[PDB]
Amino acid sequence: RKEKIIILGSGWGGFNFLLNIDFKKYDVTLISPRNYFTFTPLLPCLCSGTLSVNVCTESIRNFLRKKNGYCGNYLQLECTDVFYEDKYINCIDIENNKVKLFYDYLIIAVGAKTNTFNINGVDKYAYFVKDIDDALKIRKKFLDILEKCTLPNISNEEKKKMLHVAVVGGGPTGVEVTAEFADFINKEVKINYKDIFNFISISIIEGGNNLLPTFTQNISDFTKENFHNLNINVLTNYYVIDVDKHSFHIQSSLNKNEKKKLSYGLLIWASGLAQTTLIQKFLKTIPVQANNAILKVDEKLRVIGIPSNNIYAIGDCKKIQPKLLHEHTNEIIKILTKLTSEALKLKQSELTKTFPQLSISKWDYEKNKKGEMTPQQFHDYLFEIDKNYKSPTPTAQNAKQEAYYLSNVFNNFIHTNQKFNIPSFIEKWKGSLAYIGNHQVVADLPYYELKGGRFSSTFWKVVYIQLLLSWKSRFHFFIDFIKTKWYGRPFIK
Amino acid sequence: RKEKIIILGSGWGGFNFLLNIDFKKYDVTLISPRNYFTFTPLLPCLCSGTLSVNVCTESIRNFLRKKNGYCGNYLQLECTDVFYEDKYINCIDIENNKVKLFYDYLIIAVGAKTNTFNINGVDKYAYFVKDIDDALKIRKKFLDILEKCTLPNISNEEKKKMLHVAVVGGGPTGVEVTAEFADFINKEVKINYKDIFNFISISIIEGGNNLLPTFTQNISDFTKENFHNLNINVLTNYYVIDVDKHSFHIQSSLNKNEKKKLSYGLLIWASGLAQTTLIQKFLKTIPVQANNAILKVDEKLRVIGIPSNNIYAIGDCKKIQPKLLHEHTNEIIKILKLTSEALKLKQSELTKTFPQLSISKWDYEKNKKGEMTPQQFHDYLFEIDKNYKSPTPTAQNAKQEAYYLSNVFNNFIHTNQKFNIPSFIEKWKGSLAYIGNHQVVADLPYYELKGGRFSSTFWKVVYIQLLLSWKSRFHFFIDFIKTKWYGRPFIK
Numbered sequence: 001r002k003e004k005i006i007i008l009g010s011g012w013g014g015f016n017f018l019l020n021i022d023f024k025k026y027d028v029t030l031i032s033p034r035n036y037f038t039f040t041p042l043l044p045c046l047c048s049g050t051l052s053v054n055v056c057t058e059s060i061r062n063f064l065r066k067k068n069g070y071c072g073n074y075l076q077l078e079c080t081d082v083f084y085e086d087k088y089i090n091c092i093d094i095e096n097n098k099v100k101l102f103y104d105y106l107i108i109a110v111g112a113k114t115n116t117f118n119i120n121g122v123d124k125y126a127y128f129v130k131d132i133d134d135a136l137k138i139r140k141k142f143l144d145i146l147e148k149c150t151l152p153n154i155s156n157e158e159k160k161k162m163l164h165v166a167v168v169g170g171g172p173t174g175v176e177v178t179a180e181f182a183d184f185i186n187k188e189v190k191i192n193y194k195d196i197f198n199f200i201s202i203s204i205i206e207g208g209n210n211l212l213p214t215f216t217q218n219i220s221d222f223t224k225e226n227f228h229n230l231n232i233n234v235l236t237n238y239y240v241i242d243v244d245k246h247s248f249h250i251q252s253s254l255n256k257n258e259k260k261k262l263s264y265g266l267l268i269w270a271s272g273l274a275q276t277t278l279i280q281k282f283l284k285t286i287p288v289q290a291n292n293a294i295l296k297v298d299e300k301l302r303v304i305g306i307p308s309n310n311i312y313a314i315g316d317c318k319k320i321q322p323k324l325l326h327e328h329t330n331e332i333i334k335i336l337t338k339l340t341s342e343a344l345k346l347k348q349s350e351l352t353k354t355f356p357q358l359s360i361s362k363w364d365y366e367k368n369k370k371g372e373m374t375p376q377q378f379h380d381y382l383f384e385i386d387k388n389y390k391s392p393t394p395t396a397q398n399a400k401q402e403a404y405y406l407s408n409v410f411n412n413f414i415h416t417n418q419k420f421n422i423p424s425f426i427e428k429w430k431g432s433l434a435y436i437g438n439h440q441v442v443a444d445l446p447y448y449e450l451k452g453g454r455f456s457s458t459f460w461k462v463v464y465i466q467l468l469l470s471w472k473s474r475f476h477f478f479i480d481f482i483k484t485k486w487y488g489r490p491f492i493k
Numbered sequence: 494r495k496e497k498i499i500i501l502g503s504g505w506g507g508f509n510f511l512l513n514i515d516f517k518k519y520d521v522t523l524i525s526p527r528n529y530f531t532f533t534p535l536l537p538c539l540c541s542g543t544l545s546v547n548v549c550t551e552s553i554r555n556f557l558r559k560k561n562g563y564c565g566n567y568l569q570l571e572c573t574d575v576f577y578e579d580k581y582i583n584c585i586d587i588e589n590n591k592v593k594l595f596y597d598y599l600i601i602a603v604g605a606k607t608n609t610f611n612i613n614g615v616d617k618y619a620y621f622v623k624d625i626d627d628a629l630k631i632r633k634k635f636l637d638i639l640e641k642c643t644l645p646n647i648s649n650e651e652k653k654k655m656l657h658v659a660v661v662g663g664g665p666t667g668v669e670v671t672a673e674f675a676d677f678i679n680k681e682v683k684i685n686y687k688d689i690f691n692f693i694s695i696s697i698i699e700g701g702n703n704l705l706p707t708f709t710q711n712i713s714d715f716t717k718e719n720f721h722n723l724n725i726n727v728l729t730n731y732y733v734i735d736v737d738k739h740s741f742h743i744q745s746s747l748n749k750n751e752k753k754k755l756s757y758g759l760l761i762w763a764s765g766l767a768q769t770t771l772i773q774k775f776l777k778t779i780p781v782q783a784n785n786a787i788l789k790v791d792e793k794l795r796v797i798g799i800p801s802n803n804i805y806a807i808g809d810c811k812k813i814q815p816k817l818l819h820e821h822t823n824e825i826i827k828i829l830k831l832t833s834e835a836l837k838l839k840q841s842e843l844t845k846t847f848p849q850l851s852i853s854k855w856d857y858e859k860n861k862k863g864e865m866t867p868q869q870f871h872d873y874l875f876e877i878d879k880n881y882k883s884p885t886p887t888a889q890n891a892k893q894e895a896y897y898l899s900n901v902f903n904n905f906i907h908t909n910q911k912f913n914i915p916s917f918i919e920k921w922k923g924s925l926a927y928i929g930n931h932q933v934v935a936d937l938p939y940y941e942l943k944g945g946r947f948s949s950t951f952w953k954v955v956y957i958q959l960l961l962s963w964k965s966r967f968h969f970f971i972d973f974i975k976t977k978w979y980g981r982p983f984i985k
């Protein structure tokens with residue numbers, strides 16, 4: 001008779017919600033086709049053999065018994081439909097048997113998938129890099145190619161075509177995967193495959209001018225410089241537009257007329273995100289959202305358009321559409337002293353609990369001061385703040401923070417003295433890191449920039465050994481680096 | 494213009510030959526469809542998640558440069574034919590492209606495969622345990638089943654049938670794989686799957702009366718006792734005769750007409766050896782060996798029936814057929830009045846020619862004979878010949894053969910010792926087995942281990958020395974810490 005919370009997904013959102021939700025207060029079931037949590041930041045290290053599967057993983061069933069003594073459940077299913085009207089979901093097991101399950105609360109955390117842009121042959125020929133098996137598939141293919149090119153039944157020009165590694169995407173994923181392959185190629189591969197080492201080349205391809213565009217221009221320039229010193233072909237300002245079995249095509253971003261055909265052996269696709277079929281389906285089911293491209297939620301992470309307000313979504317599968325300021329103008333006016341921008345800002349602490357977009361991290365009050373306004377003008381101003389609101393970026397950092405917010409809201413606000421005092425979710429940006437090869441780490445932190453150096457790696461390791469969610473994983477983190485330092489990357493495939 | 498040695502296979506034989514063969518003296522190429530060496534004794538620990546792949550493995554290319562500066566080569570191919578007349582072999586890559594290669598010496602070390610005994614459904618439905626991939630497939634299937642049986646769309650009756658693990662074979666492989674699963678089931682699985690744990694059962698099936706037949710009766714009895722304490726169904730004196738998708742059939746060894754149909758979820762097949770298709774093919778190519786079931790070699794490991802004497806075989810793919818004593822009677826008489834004790838007295842030196850004369854191959858005291866006539870001596874010699882047993886198909890023997898033969902190439906073949914090449918004689922060092930719940934058994938010369946608090950410690954001290962790199966020793970040590978402090982993983 002405890003209320004049932006179903007969690008869909010075992011990713012950063014779902015798993016972290018699981019870790020914090022009170023199993024005494026609720027009856028909790030996580031549902032996911034994947035029986036482990038994947039620690040995605042270390043996924044590129046898996047591509048090169050620097051770290052093991054154990055450090056990139058947490059098994060869900062190890063976290064189903066909290067110290068209180070009460071338990072949670074886990075089912076290995078893939079949710080295929082949500083029926084918000086009747087409070088249930090349809091799933092399928094791995095043998096396509098339907099399973100029907102009821103909930104009182106649904107926490108959707110199914111994440112996003114890799115975007116092919118409908119380009120011909122991305123699904124067919126390219127390797128994605130979004131989970132454990134993806135990374136392992138990529139490692140093996142690479143090692144497979146190395147062995148195939150050591151055979152005598154092969155010409156030097158066949159070798160040059162096949163030993164070309166193309167990475168599409170100059171975001172952090174693409175950049176880190178390239179970096180890691182570069183280290184592998186310049187170390188272990190160089191030693192054990194000398195006769196063919198010089199036919200090997202890596203290219204990274206990016207539509208815009210900069211690698212790591214969302215970081216900072218100095219970090220971008222440094223990343224490109226460092227890539228040059230590693231003899232990585234940096235093909236920025238190029239868009240991949242077609243993919244065939246042995247070659248792909250690129251179009252210059254600077255001249256629409258300039259195309260190139262490139263040979264390749266291994267093609268890694270690390271472009272942006274796209275929605276799961278479950279989300280596409282679910283959207284059609286909600287009158288208000290029937291033609292949305294992504295699932296929209298409250299400022300409280302409630303899925304808009306559900307009469308019951310019993311479905312939440314966290315992580316990559318959702319954008320936040322908060323309660324509009326300009327729909328509550330008069331009410332906000334009463335709350336104030338004047339009627340200036342800094343009248344508003346003076347009450348920004350209190351009003352931020354209701355409107356996230358009022359946050360000093362969401363609205364620049366100084367780049368936008370406004371002298372005394374008439375009510376209508378104030379309403380226009382409020383409207384600008386509304387339009388300026390940016391939904392949290394699709395990162396593990398945000399998914400984790402959303403997961404702790406929401407679970408704590410279930411633990412401490414719903415079904416307690418505070419049912420109505422629930423604050424709206426606001427991220428704190430903690431910074432971003434990236435490995436860019438050859439011991440060089442970059443970090444774009446709130447008050448710092450790292451641009452390489454002897455102690456860059458050290459900073460990276462102190463950061464991530466603390467972001468790991470178990471002592472088991474910390475053990476492996478430590479051991480795996482010793483092993484890689486003393487003995488090297490492995491060639492088992 | 495260095496002579497070319499081609500090694501076929503990257504197992505205990507091939508890899509250890511590679512480790513010791515002098516790359517300065519020869520131009521060596523190992524050919525194997527598998528680019529790593531598999532440390533098979535720890536393979537059952539891989540089934541249960543106790544140890545990792547890193548401790549069961551060595552990557553061939555890490556060993557292609559010895560410290561003197563000379564190199565070896567490796568090619569990822571599967572040999573499909575040997576043409577002994579013309580000294581070349583045909584291979585195929587993984588995309589079925591033919592490759593043709595010339596050698597001066599061929600070292601065949603392709604091992605053996607699992608024997609299905611042609612039984613319907615073994616290949617189709619059963620899991621084998623001969624390599625890394627096998628162990629991981631086995632591990633996954635089990636975890637798959639546990640998850641499937643936690644679903645609601647499943648009856649307790651379906652659960653009981655699906656969560657039955659049957660292991661066919663009471664040899665050390667079968668026994669060790671059963672033990673490891675028992676440990677996993679009784680620890681990590683019991684904690685994380687309380688609801689369905691009592692639907693789980695393990696059976697081991699063995700045709701003879703004993704588990705670990707080739708050990709000791711005390712060790713066999715102790716292994717069976719320990720198995721019952723763990724609630725493993727020990728179905729000795731049963732053999733499997735048929736296999737279907739959800740059930741298999743067994744026949745009593747004690748009553749020809751008692752049969753049983755058993756349901757199962759996971760069927761593991763560890764029944765003993767059979768020959769590779771390469772060896773079957775190659776045999777038909779050798780006139781004197783054309784109807785053999787197994788490849789026979791000299792007492793010097795040279796494949797018999799080859800005019801050039803440039804093809805060797807080591808490991809599980811071969812049996813030794815030594816030079817016959819009774820074909821050399823008169824000569825032996827001349828070396829030596831004319832008793833078994835006379836013969837034994839010269840046994841150390843004659844053993845360099847005939848391995849069957851070894852005190853480890855022939856019981857001189859249980860077979861003493863007084864003065865013989867030449868004819869009688871000839872008959873005696875003949876008994877020694879027929880008593881000879883080829884090395885048992887073990888890693889221990891494949892390794893010892895590989896060190897012997899590589900040492901012959903290094904220090905005999907192109908030196909002034911060409912003619913004093915001694916015949917190969919194993920030295921048995923003992924055998925160990927993990928039998929679950931921390932109990933190790935060992936059947937050593939002069940000792941028997943039957944369990945104990947310090948049983949496991951002995952096992953760990955032995956195998957950390959048997960590992961062939963410091964890398965692997967690191968992982969050996971670390972993997973046991975990991976398993977102790979944090980437990981076995983459920984990743985699949």
Ligand SMILES: Cc1cc2nc3c(=O)[nH]c(=O)nc-3n(C[C@H](O)[C@H](O)[C@H](O)COP(=O)(O)OP(=O)(O)OC[C@H]3O[C@@H](n4cnc5c(N)ncnc54)[C@H](O)[C@@H]3O)c2cc1C
Pocket residue numbers: 008009010011012013014031032033034040041042043044077078079080109110111112129130131173276278314315316317394395396397398399433
């Ligand atoms: C290589 C890589 C490196 C990254 N590094 C960083 C980083 O350093 N910092 C950072 O902030 N972010 C990083 N990210 C981004 C981060 O992984 C995502 O933002 C994060 O995964 C969002 O979490 P999520 O729970 O929404 O989705 P996921 O973590 O992808 O989880 C989705 C889960 O839903 C499951 N699922 C899918 N379909 C269904 C279905 N219909 N039913 C039930 N379950 C389903 C999946 O199995 C999965 O378990 C990285 C991403 C990648 C790919």
Ligand SMILES: Cc1cc2nc3c(=O)[nH]c(=O)nc-3n(C[C@H](O)[C@H](O)[C@H](O)COP(=O)(O)OP(=O)(O)OC[C@H]3O[C@@H](n4cnc5c(N)ncnc54)[C@H](O)[C@@H]3O)c2cc1C
Pocket residue numbers: 501502503504505506507524525526527533534535536537570571572573602603604605622623624666769771807808809810886887888889890891925
């Ligand atoms: C689970 C298990 C545990 C064991 N434990 C022990 C133990 O504790 N002690 C002990 O003494 N023995 C043990 N053994 C036995 C030991 O593994 C074998 O006796 C040993 O492998 C024999 O070595 P080999 O080189 O002849 O064959 P393998 O080690 O099997 O090597 C054969 C190699 O040949 C390759 N190959 C196959 N076909 C071809 C082809 N056509 N062309 C080229 N290469 C080919 C294979 O890929 C493989 O690399 C165990 C065996 C198993 C399965």
Ligand SMILES: NC(=O)c1ccc[n+]([C@@H]2O[C@H](COP(=O)([O-])OP(=O)(O)OC[C@H]3O[C@@H](n4cnc5c(N)ncnc54)[C@H](O)[C@@H]3O)[C@@H](O)[C@H]2O)c1
Pocket residue numbers: 041168169170171172173174205206207208213238239240241270271272273393394395396432433434435
């Ligand atoms: N180290 C970190 O902190 C880290 C690491 C990985 C991911 N993340 C987060 O995960 C999310 C996704 O990251 P991501 O790297 O996979 O995607 P991304 O959107 O950040 O980068 C994709 C890049 O590929 C380009 N692109 C798209 N289609 C292309 C084409 N056809 N040809 C060439 N270039 C093309 C885009 O211009 C874009 O710059 C991001 O929000 C990111 O911040 C963070």
Ligand SMILES: NC(=O)c1ccc[n+]([C@@H]2O[C@H](COP(=O)([O-])OP(=O)(O)OC[C@H]3O[C@@H](n4cnc5c(N)ncnc54)[C@H](O)[C@@H]3O)[C@@H](O)[C@H]2O)c1
Pocket residue numbers: 534610661662663664665666667698699700701706731732733734763764765766885886887888924925926927
């Ligand atoms: N711990 C160790 O030292 C160790 C471990 C594994 C293997 N080995 C060596 O590797 C070789 C192979 O060992 P193995 O265990 O794989 O095979 P095995 O030959 O030693 O034993 C197989 C057993 O299964 C039985 N069997 C065969 N077909 C059957 C059927 N249809 N139904 C029921 N029982 C059936 C046989 O009676 C036999 O005892 C051996 O030489 C062994 O010594 C040693």
Ligand SMILES: [Mg+2]
Pocket residue numbers: 008009010011012013014015109110111315
């Ligand atoms: Mg999730």
Ligand SMILES: [Mg+2]
Pocket residue numbers: 010011012037038039040
């Ligand atoms: Mg994840």
Ligand SMILES: [Mg+2]
Pocket residue numbers: 013108109110111112314315316317318
């Ligand atoms: Mg999500």
Ligand SMILES: [Mg+2]
Pocket residue numbers: 110111112113316
């Ligand atoms: Mg996602």
Ligand SMILES: [Mg+2]
Pocket residue numbers: 501502503504505506507508602603604808
């Ligand atoms: Mg071999």
Ligand SMILES: [Mg+2]
Pocket residue numbers: 503504505530531532533
């Ligand atoms: Mg082997």
Ligand SMILES: [Mg+2]
Pocket residue numbers: 502506601602603604605807808809810811
């Ligand atoms: Mg062999």
Ligand SMILES: [Mg+2]
Pocket residue numbers: 603604605606809
């Ligand atoms: Mg074999």
